[PDB]
Design a binder for this molecule. Structure first.
Ligand code: SF4
Ligand code: SF4
Ligand code: SF4
Ligand code: SF4
Ligand code: FES
Ligand SMILES: [Zn+2]
Lengths: 98, 118, 56, 85, 48, 182, 63, 279, 92, 689
């Protein structure tokens, strides 16, 4: 919601590396598939990269100013857990930037 | 059959006998013959550089034995003592001049050798 | 004009290999090594005969 | 003789070669011999007509016109011409 | 006395350097204006 | 002996087939440790001739490298290199060469330097090693040679020509009816 | 390093290396190399055998 | 259709041979080229009354004939341009307000080329975006067709403009050709299709031209008389048209010698004339 | 006379820039053999096929090569693929 | 019927009933001499070297032309087979000119190979040999008709593979001409395959003529970057000089054929290259300086310049390593824009690899049934892709186009050349809509240049709506025909690396050209900007930069390229870069260290670990990873603008011989442009096909 809207102003990139055929990445894959349109529409200018590998470890990386890396594991994380991780990473920018 | 000083032979008109077949370079047992060839301005198959490192050349005459157009020859010149190891590295122009100096005896030897099976 | 027989048809390239099993290897031991006789299924006349027949 | 077109200006591309209306009309019957799917099978009658109407000398321009009519390669037309004596 | 020419020719066989500008020249923005020296002529650019 | 008998354990040791996983030992490796984790998880766990995706294993400088023969006092760079292992088939210029190619996997180390000494414009290599590529009967044999020499591997599987139906009867196929086609 | 020198060259490319092996007797080594090549080829030098030049050269080298 | 006489008659008899291009065009070939050009123009939004200013230089004789055929089939106005200076080209464009401008890019416009002079006249082409309509100062200028090998900013290729419509999936409908439509504006004179046909017939009657009489038009093809004696007569009577753009007089004579009795439309500064048949 | 790298020159000298003075080749090939062979004249041959060996006997020159003197264009000479000699048709 | 049983030299073998005798021999590792039958060409009995003696058979049977009969016994090692092969070889050698020393086939000639192995041993025809003059077909095909054995290989390859019709058999008897009837050149974007197709020294590479023999060439297998396909090739080199390149058998990329640019543009790096970093003065003087001084000046300028006034243009010669290096160098300096040009920008987000790459891949062309091209010229863009498309079109394919009328060897319908046809299709009231709906396998292919137009995102939205509505990406059949023809491997890698091409800086006081030299205007960069060019050959970026940092070519660096079908190619570092050129990754790391933000990259392994942290799909070499979010990436969206301008759609390429810096700096490419440009230039459609 509001955290989804503030992503365009909080960070500089959002990367979702997952595995197409992994249970640990199944939750992340479902979360990316279901809610892709809302974030793409509300923040059309925010780089939102999505990548999948056969045996990738599920990582959601928030890249903030000065190329600050905020990779967080999302392996076997539920959709609510994925949303909480997104909210947290979209809220750490002020602490990370300062 | 004395395998003397390596030299580049030519046709009686003076045109280069070397046809850039790389047979000499593929036949030098120590790879002592080096060739760098590109199409000639007239289009002939001639090398831009033909080098024979006498420091690594055994003067074996294998290039002459496998010569396709009788280009590489072993002239009777044996007094090739060199005061400079760099000067000992003969090249295309040097070989051409050496062949020019001793072409006549080389021609007689070639005629006699060809007459052996003829 | 005889260009058919320039290449030799016969060359001294005959090779022969002779293989012999271990001299001390027993017939029952040979059958066990070849798998015809089970390692435990020894000293039985019927099993030994069957293994020997299979090996032969 | 020469399997390749000799460098003669008499057989050059600039030679004017156009089939006669009678030859054009005669093409109606010749094409009906072979199926419409294979119109190149009339190349022999076309070459015969060309040789008849061009002073027993087939021009390269005539061959090009035949290829245009036959919907076949000009190389194929030239090969068919040279293959026969 | 002319080993430099032979060295330049040998290097130019596979490592011929780019002829960069030397001196003053026109600059169309940050691009220094200099004409190419290719011996071949592009006929398609100048044809009718 | 290109394809060993995989139906038995005698084809090759399972240790030879396994690929060592990279563990962070340098400062940069510790920095991008998640990248190392991804490279270990996603890479194939086994190396076989029947593999499909090219894979790179970094130089394992450990006890397995005890059989390295290029770590001389004056030459301390050879036993840290990574060579490329691929099947070098016959060239496209000729189809029936005098010495057929494609029966041994070639492992080649890239040329370190090649320069023309100007005394005669003569070619010279700064590294006398890697002058000629080596040939191995089996991919497992090549892997064992690389591990024994402690050299990193970049193994790429070859892409061959597919089997195609060849027949001279295809040269005169019947097109079909004109009216039916239209 | 004549061993690797011959091993890194074609069959004819390593021919004179045999002369340098036995400097005093360069013909016996060459004859041995030729005989070994023929044995590998599974044949024999008919012209060399019929000309007896191999025997004469071996005797001269021995002398 | 007025131009479909020789097309419906045979469809295989040759129509025009571009000696300057070494290309021979049949009646079907000319019809197909005209159809493709007309379809490309109509699909580009060039409605009836659109003016096309021709800045090509002679040598594109086959291009000139194809463009004339495409303009006549659709029914748009064509105005040749004889610009030799940047000011001349600017004045011609301003007075004409042509919808399209076709130029031979490599044609020399005095010290510069035709494309260079046009760019000097129109700087907006340099700033035209890729896949975007150009925004120029002219009120009615909407198309730039270059005859060069390269792609010029703010311009399109003649080949790229034309689209060869198919027999099934084609959607653009070509408007029917009307006789009263003006097709040629040369020397401030407006020439209609009826005027062109009348001129062709009267000239054939005045130069003793038969049905089977080749016309070898050399040099300039922009003349309305040259058009009448070239592709127009072939579309009418099937005569063999020989385009000899930028061809020497000796070469034209040799080509006529390759023919038997041809009307030689000799090139000159004035509108192309005609001479006696044979030599 | 014609400028090098032209289309006509490329079509003529088999996509190569012919050197007339021959000094460019005499430096590039380190031998004036190009001009020395160019000093030779053009020879007219009656037969449409010639056998060139660069000499007088087999193995006394280059291997024998058969050159076709009858081409599409009359009077077009051909230089030997083995020697520097060039032969042309007797009449056409 | 399913598994027939034959006996090859007395060895029982279970083979297929439809395979040929030569097929069975090759499958069973039995090498049979052959000179005419090519596995990718038409089967013909032109040669008789495959005539094999079979048990209980009267005459020898051409194994390539003869299939396997159940129970047949082929005694290939029999004396009868040996005698037949010797007779055939002796007959073949009757008229072969003695040109081996003067022919490029020496060392790799199948003729001499069969003669030494399957030949008689001596010759007995003591008569004058027939002679035929050679032809003139341009600077790409070297003609020697004297050794031409009239094997029909050129004719078969041109008719069936290249699709051009210019080769045929003229004459009869012993004077048949293996060449064209009229004097012309063979320009069909596959001229390098003609030399590779001639079994004798009849056709050879003229640029490589008399260069050397196979005995002095060192061949290394790599992948090309000149074409968007990146077809595998083998580069043969001799010492520090690269000799030539040949195609490699890659059925997944380009079978065994390559384009002329891939074949002949390797020479561009041999001249007009930058060997040292040079500083461009205010007066334009280029002065060589030590790399330390240049790096320090660049770092000082970057430190002094504001973070909002630094921009760059990415070059075509950009690998994944260089792209990631530039991205990291910018990010560490708080920069978030990787584009400095605003005209000609690809309107595709790097978000999804499905939308950033061709979802149908190379084999999709044969797999797809109805193919709709929009702004793609497969002939000039990719001769291999065009040849594959033609091969598919021969069998069961329908091809439509919505762009300019091209001259493809096959027949392609032309729906239009402007956006009106596309708008009609998008509205659904178009005849092509029914054909697309009826297609079992649909595919849409659009060029990168077309997608980079001003209505780029609008055209992309229209195409996506059409594909979703028509069924190009149809989940019911799990077929995804939506494909994009990229024109820059660097741009493709940028899309795969997450660098947004749309992030273009309006004003930048720093301009870095990472090998970019095409589609650049002198006014697109403000004159008050410090400009550096990290390139190899200097054409435009060398002039447009205040500093020039020499870099390594594609063959001078172990680079990672992404074939647009989704393939990872590890192009090996064949030779060292000229002069003192440093690696692009090395240069970027050194600059980052000197700029106070060093990147944690000390080796290629560490760079690959960082890339895996960025993108894991790039670590699997020679593999196309499946994409399970294809339809989500290409899902139709409401409210997305798709207004299209009515201007015509064109193909970017004009001269196939000159498209890049190395291509323009290639003298072979210069001669190709001098000769074939006027020959192949035509503004009129070729109805003859
Ligand atoms: S064998 Fe003779 S003609 Fe051939 S390359 Fe050697 S020297 Fe030249
Ligand atoms: S004489 Fe022998 S060692 Fe000397 S260059 Fe000739 S082949 Fe080589
Ligand atoms: S093609 Fe050339 S190399 Fe091969 S046999 Fe014929 S002349 Fe010799
Ligand atoms: S020229 Fe070569 S490829 Fe063509 S038919 Fe002759 S042998 Fe075959
Ligand atoms: S190559 Fe087998 S029949 Fe010709
Ligand atoms: Zn000769």
């Amino acid at each position: 919601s509001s955290w989804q809207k503030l992503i365009g102003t909080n960070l500089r990139e959002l990367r979702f590396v997952f595995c197409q055929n992994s249970q640990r990445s199944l939750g992340l894959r479902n979360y990316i598939a279901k809610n892709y349109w809302n974030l793409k529409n509300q923040n059309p200018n925010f780089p939102l990269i999505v990548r999948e590998c056969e045996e990738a470890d599920p990582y959601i990386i928030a890249r903030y100013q000065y190329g600050v890396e905020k990779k967080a594991f999302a392996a076997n994380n539920n959709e609510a857990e994925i949303e909480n991780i997104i909210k947290t990473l979209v809220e750490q920018s002020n602490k990370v930037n300062n | 059959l004395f395998r003397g000083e390596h030299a580049l032979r030519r046709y009686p008109t003076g045109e280069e006998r070397c046809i850039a077949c790389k047979l000499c370079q593929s036949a030098c047992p120590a790879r002592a013959i080096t060739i760098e060839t590109e199409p000639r301005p007239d289009g002939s198959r001639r090398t831009v550089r033909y080098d024979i490192d006498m420091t690594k050349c055994i003067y074996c005459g294998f290039c002459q034995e496998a010569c396709p157009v009788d280009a590489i020859v072993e002239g009777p010149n044996y007094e090739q003592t060199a005061y400079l190891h760099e000067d000992l590295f003969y090249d295309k122009y040097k070989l051409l001049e050496n062949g020019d100096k001793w072409e006549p005896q080389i021609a007689r030897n070639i005629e006699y050798l060809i007459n052996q099976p003829l | 004009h005889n260009i058919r027989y320039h290449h030799e048809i016969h060359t001294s390239d005959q090779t022969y290999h002779s293989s012999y099993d271990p001299v001390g290897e027993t017939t029952t031991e040979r059958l066990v090594r070849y798998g015809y006789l089970n390692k435990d299924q020894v000293n039985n006349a019927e099993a030994v005969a069957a293994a020997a027949k299979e090996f032969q | 003789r020469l399997a390749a077109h000799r460098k003669n200006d008499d057989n050059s591309d600039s030679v004017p070669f156009e089939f006669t209306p009678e030859n054009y009309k005669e093409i109606e019957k010749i094409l009906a011999k072979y199926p419409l799917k294979q119109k190149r099978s009339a190349v022999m009658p076309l070459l015969y007509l060309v040789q008849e109407q061009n002073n027993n000398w087939v021009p390269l321009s005539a061959m090009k016109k035949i290829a245009k009519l036959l919907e076949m390669p000009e190389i194929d037309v030239y090969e068919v011409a040279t293959f026969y004596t | 006395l002319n080993r430099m020419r032979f060295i330049t020719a040998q290097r130019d066989r596979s490592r011929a350097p780019w002829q960069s500008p030397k001196g003053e020249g026109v600059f169309q923005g940050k691009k220094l204006i200099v004409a190419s020296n290719s011996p071949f002529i592009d006929d398609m650019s100048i044809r009718d | 002996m290109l394809l060993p008998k995989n139906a038995i354990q005698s084809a090759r040791y399972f240790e030879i087939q396994k690929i060592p996983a990279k563990i962070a030992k340098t400062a940069n490796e510790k920095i991008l440790s998640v990248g190392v984790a991804q490279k270990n998880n996603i890479q194939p766990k086994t190396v076989t001739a029947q593999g499909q995706i090219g894979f790179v294993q970094h130089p394992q400088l450990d006890s397995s490298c005890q059989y390295t023969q290029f770590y001389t006092p004056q030459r301390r760079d050879i036993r840290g290199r990574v060579a490329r292992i691929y099947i070098q088939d016959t060239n496209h210029m000729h189809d029936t060469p005098q010495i057929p190619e494609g029966y041994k996997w070639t492992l080649e180390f890239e040329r370190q330097a090649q320069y023309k000494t100007p005394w005669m414009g003569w070619s010279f290599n700064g590294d006398t090693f890697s002058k000629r590529n080596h040939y191995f009967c089996t991919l497992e044999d090549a892997i064992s040679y690389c591990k024994q020499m402690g050299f990193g591997y970049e193994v790429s599987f070859p892409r061959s020509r597919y089997h195609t139906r060849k027949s001279y009867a295809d040269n005169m196929l019947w097109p079909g009816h004109d009216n039916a086609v239209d | 390093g004549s061993e690797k020198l011959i091993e890194d060259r074609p069959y004819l490319q390593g021919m004179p290396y045999f002369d340098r092996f036995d400097y005093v007797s360069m013909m016996v080594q060459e004859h041995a190399y030729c005989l070994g090549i023929e044995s590998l080829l599974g044949t024999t030098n008919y012209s060399a055998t019929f000309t007896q030049i191999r025997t004469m050269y071996d005797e001269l080298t021995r002398i | 259709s007025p131009l479909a006489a020789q097309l419906a008659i045979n469809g295989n008899r040759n129509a025009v041979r571009y000696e300057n291009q070494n290309r021979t065009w049949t009646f079907n070939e000319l019809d197909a080229h005209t159809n493709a050009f007309a379809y490309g123009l109509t699909e580009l939004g060039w409605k009836a009354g659109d003016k096309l200013l021709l800045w090509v230089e002679k040598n594109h004789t086959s291009e000139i004939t194809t463009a004339q055929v495409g303009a006549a089939k659709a029914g748009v106005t064509l105005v040749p341009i004889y610009a030799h200076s940047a000011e001349e080209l600017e004045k011609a464009l301003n007075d004409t307000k042509a919808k399209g401008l076709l130029l031979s890019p490599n044609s020399k416009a005095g010290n510069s080329k035709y494309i260079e002079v046009v760019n000097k006249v129109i700087p907006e082409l340099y700033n035209t975006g890729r896949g975007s309509t150009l925004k120029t100062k002219f009120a009615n200028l909407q198309h730039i067709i270059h005859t060069g090998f390269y792609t010029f900013p703010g311009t399109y290729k003649f080949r790229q403009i034309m689209v060869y419509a198919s027999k099934n999936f084609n959607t653009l409908t070509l408007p029917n050709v009307e006789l009263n439509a003006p097709l040629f504006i040369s020397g401030n004179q407006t020439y209609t299709l009826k005027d062109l046909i009348s001129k062709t017939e009267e000239n054939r009657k005045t130069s003793k031209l038969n049905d089977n009489t080749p016309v070898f038009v050399t040099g300039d093809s922009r003349s309305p008389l040259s058009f009448s004696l070239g592709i127009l007569n072939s579309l009418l009577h099937g005569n063999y048209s020989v385009y000899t753009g930028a061809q020497d007089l000796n070469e034209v004579g040799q080509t006529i010698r390759f023919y038997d009795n041809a009307l030689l439309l000799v090139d000159g500064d004035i509108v192309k004339a005609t001479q006696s048949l044979k030599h | 006379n014609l400028n090098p790298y032209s289309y006509e020159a490329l079509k003529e000298n088999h996509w190569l820039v012919s050197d007339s003075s021959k000094k460019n080749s005499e430096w590039t090939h380190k031998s004036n053999a190009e001009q020395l062979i160019a000093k030779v004249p053009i020879i007219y041959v009656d037969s449409n096929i010639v056998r060139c060996i660069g000499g007088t006997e087999i193995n006394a020159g280059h291997p024998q090569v058969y050159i076709q003197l009858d081409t599409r264009k009359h009077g077009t000479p051909q230089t030997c693929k083995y020697c520097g000699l060039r032969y042309a048709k007797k009449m056409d | 019927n399913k598994q027939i049983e034959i006996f090859i030299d007395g060895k029982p073998a279970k083979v297929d009933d439809s395979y040929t005798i030569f097929q069975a021999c090759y499958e069973n590792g039995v090498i049979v001499p052959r000179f005419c039958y090519h596995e990718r060409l038409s089967v013909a009995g032109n040669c008789r070297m495959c005539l094999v003696e079979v048990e209980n058979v009267p005459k020898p049977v051409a194994a390539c032309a003869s299939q396997v009969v159940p129970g047949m016994k082929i005694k290939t090692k029999s004396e009868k087979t040996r005698i037949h092969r010797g007779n055939v070889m002796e007959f073949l050698l009757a008229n072969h000119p003695l040109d081996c020393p003067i022919c490029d086939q020496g060392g790799e000639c199948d003729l001499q190979d069969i003669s030494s192995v399957y030949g008689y041993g001596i010759s007995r025809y003591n008569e004058y040999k027939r002679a035929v003059e050679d032809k003139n077909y341009g600077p790409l095909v070297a003609t020697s008709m004297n050794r031409c054995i009239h094997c029909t290989r050129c004719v078969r390859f041109a008719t069936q593979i290249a699709g051009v019709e210019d080769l045929g058999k003229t004459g009869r008897g012993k004077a048949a001409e293996i060449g064209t009837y009229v004097e012309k050149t063979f320009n069909t974007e596959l001229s390098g395959n003609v030399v590779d197709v001639c079994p004798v020294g009849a056709l050879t590479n003229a640029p490589y003529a008399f260069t050397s023999r196979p005995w002095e060439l060192k061949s290394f297998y790599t992948s090309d970057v000149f074409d968007t396909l990146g077809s595998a090739i083998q580069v043969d080199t001799r010492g520090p000089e690269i000799m030539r390149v040949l195609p490699r058998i890659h059925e997944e990329i380009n079978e065994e054929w390559i384009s002329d640019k891939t074949r002949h543009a390797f020479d561009g790096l041999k001249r007009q290259r930058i060997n040292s970093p040079m500083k461009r003065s205010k007066d334009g003087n280029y002065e060589d300086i030590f790399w330390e001084e240049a790096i320090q000046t660049i770092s000082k300028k970057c430190l002094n310049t504001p973070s909002d006034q630094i921009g760059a243009i990415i070059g075509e010669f950009a690998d994944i390593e260089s792209i990631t290096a530039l991205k990291d160098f910018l990010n560490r300096l708080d920069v978030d824009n990787f584009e400095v040009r605003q005209h000609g920008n690809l309107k595709v987000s790097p978000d999804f690899r499905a939308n950033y790459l061709m979802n149908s891949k190379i084999t999709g062309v044969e797999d797809a049934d109805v193919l709709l091209l929009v702004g793609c010229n497969p002939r000039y863009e990719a001769p291999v892709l065009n040849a594959r498309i033609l091969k598919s079109t021969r069998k069961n394919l329908k091809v439509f186009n919505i762009g300019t009328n091209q001259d493809l060897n096959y027949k392609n319908v032309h729906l239009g050349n402007s956006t009106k046809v596309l708008k009609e299709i998008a509205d659904g009231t178009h005849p092509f809509a029914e054909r697309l709906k009826k297609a079992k396998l649909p595919m849409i292919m659009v060029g990168a240049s077309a997608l980079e137009r001003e209505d780029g995102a609008e055209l992309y939205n229209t195409l996506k709506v059409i594909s979703n509505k028509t069924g190009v990406i149809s989940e019911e059949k799990s077929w995804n025909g939506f494909n994009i023809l990229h024109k820059e491997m660097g741009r493709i890698n940028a899309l795969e690396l997450g660098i947004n091409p749309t992030s273009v800086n309006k004003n930048a006081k720093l301009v870095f050209i990472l090998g970019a030299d095409n589609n650049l205007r002198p006014e697109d960069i403000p004159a008050d900007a410090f400009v550096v060019y990290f390139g190899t050959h200097g054409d435009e970026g060398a002039y447009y930069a205040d500093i020039i940092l020499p870099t390594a070519a594609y063959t001078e660096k172990n680079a990672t390229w992404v074939n647009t079908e989704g393939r990872v190619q590890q192009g090996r570092l064949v030779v060292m870069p000229p002069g003192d050129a440093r690696e692009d990754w090395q240069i970027i790391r050194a600059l980052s260290e000197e700029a106070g933000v060093p990147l944690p990259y000390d080796s290629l392994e560490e760079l690959r670990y960082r890339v895996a942290e960025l993108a894991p799909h790039l670590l699997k070499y020679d593999y196309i990873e499946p994409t399970i979010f294809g339809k989500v990436a290409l899902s139709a969206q409401q409210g997305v603008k798709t207004t299209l301008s009515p201007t015509p759609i064109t193909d970017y390429i004009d001269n196939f011989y000159m498209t890049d810096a190395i291509s323009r700096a290639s003298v072979t490419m210069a001669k190709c442009s001098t000769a074939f440009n006027h020959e192949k230039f035509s503004n009129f459609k070729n109805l003859a096909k």
